[PDB]
Amino acid sequence: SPYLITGIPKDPKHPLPIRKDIDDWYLEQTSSNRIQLTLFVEALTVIQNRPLNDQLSYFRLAGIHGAPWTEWDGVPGGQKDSKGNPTGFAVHNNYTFPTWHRVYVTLYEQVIYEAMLDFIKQNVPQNGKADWENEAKQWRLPYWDFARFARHGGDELRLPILVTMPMVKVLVPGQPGKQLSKPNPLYRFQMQTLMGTLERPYAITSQKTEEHGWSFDLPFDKCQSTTKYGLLENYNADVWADGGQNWLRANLALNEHPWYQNLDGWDSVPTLQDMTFRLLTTGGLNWGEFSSTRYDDKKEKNWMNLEAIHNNVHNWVGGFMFSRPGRHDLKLWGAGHMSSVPVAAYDPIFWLHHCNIDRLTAIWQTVNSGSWFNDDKSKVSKDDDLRPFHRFCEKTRKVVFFRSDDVKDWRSLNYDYAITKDASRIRKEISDLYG
Amino acid sequence: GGSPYLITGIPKDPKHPLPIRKDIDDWYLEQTSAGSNRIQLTLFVEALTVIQNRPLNDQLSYFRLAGIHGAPWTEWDGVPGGQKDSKGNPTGFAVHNNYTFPTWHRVYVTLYEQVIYEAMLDFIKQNVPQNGKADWENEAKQWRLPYWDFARFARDELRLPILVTMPMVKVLVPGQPGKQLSKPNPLYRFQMQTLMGTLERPYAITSQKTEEHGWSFDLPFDKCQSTTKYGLLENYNADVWADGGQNWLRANLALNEHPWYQNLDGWDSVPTLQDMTFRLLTTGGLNWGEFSSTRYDQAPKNWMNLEAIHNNVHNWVGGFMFSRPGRHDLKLWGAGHMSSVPVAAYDPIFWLHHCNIDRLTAIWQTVNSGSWFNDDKSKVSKDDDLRPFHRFCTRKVVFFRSDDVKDWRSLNYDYAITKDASRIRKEISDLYGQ
Ligand SMILES: N[C@@H](Cc1ccc(O)c(O)c1)C(=O)O
Ligand SMILES: N[C@@H](Cc1ccc(O)cc1)C(=O)O
Ligand SMILES: [Cu+2]
Ligand SMILES: [Cu+2]
Ligand SMILES: [Cu+2]
Ligand SMILES: [Cu+2]
């Protein structure tokens, strides 16, 4: 420490590699080689199995966001949210929501790439290194396009293919023709014990949430594994230890789009795809309005801001009803990690979601040049330190925290998105995907 | 070695008179409570894991025992497979749509229970400290196959068993008090080491035809490595199909929404699964033909026979919609093994479901003691051989017959509800009455 966040280093043979749609990428891989898939699976597996005292373990990286609310990279915890409760470093309900998360996703991608290089050095024979290093240097964190209809070989939105597979096949380096089935590190994350009993100070507690005006303590302390919808009130806690990846219910929620906001008076109740379309194409919006639920409290007009859409998708992926609803809403009963700020980052889909939130931000920036922390509301937050993320400042030759202006051009972090490559094409592509 | 496997039930020990098959949730809760020694849960898990890991050429492997019922339609215990139905299609030894449905399945469930008990005794011989073997053996001798009470509200909701919904389960380390080990739960699913369509001949599991909204589909069971509940959806990548998950929330939703496949036009009301089960056990005046099978049937209203309720529960547990349905039915989309006759027995819940179907039969017998293969319709099937199941008779080995298992107690098990016959109508009302 400090861990200096840069994005994957620039290699002249690999100009601005793209973050791809994780379903397109998965099909590309499994149509037509499996080297990037193998690298991602093997590297993330290593990262997930690193110990708690390693701040580049999966648990500690996920820990930056929320619970257990500890230090990271020499930056102390002890932060409080608006309710006065313990909270993480993540920015929610402020205009730095997109930029804090832009750095967070790049940290994750960078840590994964560094683990891929270690993998290659240790497992790929000389004859194969050039090719495998080429693939690592081209790889970027895929995004989950939650607003794009899934292909058939599409009419509905879905969690990623790879997220729904408990096992995945990878290559055996230096044994061309050979493959192995391994547990898929994108399917879930689990510790070796209930997360509530981890050594101090890392234990994950239950998390108090409101449902229909009443308080419930979501039993995340009783989980060994992350779950989607697997936690239900008055179920045996042995079920809670691993409540499953109930991906059919997440898919149901995505297509039923039960927005939590009051849409009384709206022109229509949009689908998730249409709400995303409106976000990207409504004219005349400023950075404050686009970026955060903070801009307009009482909205928590025929369009919804980035953070509010993102909040709904979190709920719909993780499950947002622990207590049993009325009979007419039983089809969506169940709670899980992605709906809960303190523990959502433990679910590996968190990062894929946030990769698309970053992509949506980049699209919006592209077609709203100049709208950046400069309205009357968001200007105060422009120069906030994005703790706990450190970088080396070239000008001054100092270690400093990231600030939002440092990541205004996401290309400075050495990744891009296909959709933002050609500004002559982007408006057509937005209509093709989401209109 | 020319030796038929005789099905007897667990052997009689006079200090263990007619042990009971318990409700699997009660049993699991007891086993995991501080006042229990946890030995039966350990033995069940360890024995069923061994049985599941036996090779295909072992006829007492899980795959081969599940294979008796349906696909891949091979021989078992020297009795030839490769049978064909009326329509000309492959069919297994299982009896469906006939009045021997309950008795064929009574023997099948006993076979499973017996193989498990024998594997428990092997585990004890090899893994338990000498001075604990007598205690562990006595627990094995008390153990019987638990039943899933699909019509009883969980501790108001019907639910799959607690234990069936757990991917992992903690068991004892014999001789090391307080020490437990988490292991893959053999009741959660069954899987092979490859996709089941690629197993060595003659064992490969093929796709299975199903009709949905008037169209034929291939349910892609050949592309599954694991059994699934609801995990097979049309137009999903086949890598999802390899293991489509145990989507137990959807199964529970189906149990409580009870989308009966039958036309209920003219019915006084649409009963829940608990009320339909109540009516099965309490409607008087029915004969064995009417109770036992879909074959008897135009149909009666406000009542359903045993086999028809059982069929619905199969569909609701496994998932019965592969192709995408209409908007209103999206909440129950997805297909899985338990809804398909050829492959349902591979899902470990199959046996727990049939244990309760055996229980419901025993209860009905108890309150209908004079009705047994003795109406005009069912009488002709009474003396059917229940292939492939052998027993010793005259000193010859023969096939089981329905009359050999009229008294289930001859197989050395009982149920709490039938052992206490004096209370039985009050117990049916307390459990299942509205
Ligand atoms: N559940 C939150 C949304 C949310 C959940 C988890 C998160 O990590 C997050 O950033 C936002 C809401 O209803 O508004
Ligand atoms: N699909 C059957 C139900 C069933 C399924 C599997 C079985 O093994 C038996 C019955 C029906 O609709 O009637
Ligand atoms: Cu966040
Ligand atoms: Cu988020
Ligand atoms: Cu059967
Ligand atoms: Cu059955």
Read off the CATH number of the domain in which A422 is found: 1.10.1280.10
- d(CA A195, CA A420) in angstroms, rounded, equals 40
Residue A117, token pair as written in the block:
């290089």
Annotated binding site of A for Cu(2+): 65, 92, 101, 310, 314, 354
Count of residues making up chain A: 435
Ligand 2 surroundings by CB, under 6 angstroms:
B 261, 311, 314-315, 339-341, 344
Q: Is A177 helix (H, G, I), strand (E, B) or coil?
A: coil
Instruction: Specify whether the CB–CB gap between A228 and A250 falls below 8 A.
Output: yes
Dihedral sign of CA atoms A246, A249, A255, A259 in order: negative
Amino acid at A97: F
Chain B: give the shortest CA distance to residue A218, in Å: 18
A112 CB less than 6 Å from ligand 1? no
List of chain A residues whose C-beta atoms are within 8 Å of the C-beta of residue B242: 165, 167
- Does A247 sit within 8 Å of B249, measured CB to CB? no
Buried-exposed string B83-99: b where 16+ CB fall within 10 A, e elsewhere? eeeeeeebbbbbbbebb
- d(CA A246, CA A338) in angstroms, rounded, equals 12
Residues 6+ apart with CB under 8 A from A243: A223, A225, A227, A229, A230, A231, A232, A334, A336
B10 lies in some domain: no
Instruction: Specify whether the CB–CB gap between A413 and A9 falls below 8 A.
Output: no
Please identify which residue in the block is written with the tokens 């205009």: A95
Please identify which residue in the block is written with the tokens 């005009």: B376
Chain B: give the shortest CA distance to residue A324, in Å: 11
Experimental method: X-ray
List of chain A residues whose C-beta atoms are within 8 Å of the C-beta of residue B248: 244, 246
A339 CB less than 6 Å from ligand 1? yes
- Does B168 sit within 8 Å of A239, measured CB to CB? no
Instruction: Specify whether the CB–CB gap between A146 and A157 falls below 8 A.
Output: yes
Instruction: Specify whether the CB–CB gap between A339 and A319 falls below 8 A.
Output: yes
B169 lies in some domain: yes
- d(CA A197, CA A394) in angstroms, rounded, equals 43
Amino acid at A432: D
- d(CA B331, CA B92) in angstroms, rounded, equals 33
Of A165, A255, A334, which has the smallest distance from its Cβ to B249's Cβ? A334
**Of A73, A71, A72, A90, residue with least CA distance to A81:** A90
Q: Tell me the residue range of the domain where A41 lies.
A: 18-434
B11 lies in some domain: no
B60 lies in some domain: yes
The rounded Cα B131 to chain-centroid distance in angstroms is 35
Provide the number of structural domains found in chain A: 1
- Does B239 sit within 8 Å of A161, measured CB to CB? yes
Residue A257, token pair as written in the block:
């789009």
B106 lies in some domain: yes
Q: Dihedrals φ, ψ of A209, to 5°?
A: -135, 155
Of B165, B167, B240, which has the smallest distance from its Cβ to A165's Cβ? B240
Q: How far does residue A106's CA lie from ligand 4's centre (Å)?
A: 14
- d(CA B136, CA B133) in angstroms, rounded, equals 5
Q: Could you give the residue ranges of the DSSP H alpha helices within A160-200? A: none
**Of A267, A287, A247, residue with least CA distance to A379:** A287
Cα distances (angstroms) measured from residue B348 to each of A112, A317, A376, B166, B183? 39, 29, 63, 13, 16
- d(CA B326, CA A258) in angstroms, rounded, equals 18
Please identify which residue in the block is written with the tokens 């419930």: A216
- d(CA B159, CA A302) in angstroms, rounded, equals 41
Q: How far does residue B182's CA lie from ligand 3's centre (Å)?
A: 33
- Does A166 sit within 8 Å of B253, measured CB to CB? no
Q: Is A50 helix (H, G, I), strand (E, B) or coil?
A: coil
Which residue among B101, B320, B339 is best mutated to probe the pocket of ligand 2, counting the most ligand atoms within 8 A of its Cβ? B339
Instruction: Specify whether the CB–CB gap between A97 and A292 falls below 8 A.
Output: yes
Rg over alpha carbons for chain A, rounded to the nearest Å, is 21
Of A236, A242, A246, which has the smallest distance from its Cβ to B168's Cβ? A242
Strand boundaries in B54-207, DSSP class E: 168-172, 180-184
Instruction: Specify whether the CB–CB gap between B344 and B318 falls below 8 A.
Output: yes
Amino acid at B418: T
Instruction: Specify whether the CB–CB gap between B377 and B289 falls below 8 A.
Output: yes
- d(CA A247, CA A230) in angstroms, rounded, equals 10
- d(CA B153, CA B165) in angstroms, rounded, equals 16
CB burial class (10 A; 0-12, 13-18, 19+) of residue B301?
A: exposed
A237 lies in some domain: yes
Q: Could you give the residue ranges of the DSSP H alpha helices within B54-189? A: 62-67, 101-127, 133-142
B1 lies in some domain: no
A with B: how many residue pairs have Cβ under 8 Å apart? Answer: 75
Rg over alpha carbons for chain B, rounded to the nearest Å, is 21
Q: How many CA atoms lie within 13 A of A211 on its CB side?
A: 21
Amino acid at A196: G
How many separate helices (H) and strands (E) can be counted in chain B? 13, 10
- Does A244 sit within 8 Å of B165, measured CB to CB? yes
A179 lies in some domain: yes
Q: How far does residue A266's CA lie from ligand 4's centre (Å)?
A: 25
Residue B11 is given by DSSP the state P
**Atom 4, ligand 2: residue with shortest CA distance:** B311
Give the other-Cβ count within 10 Å of A50's Cβ: 17
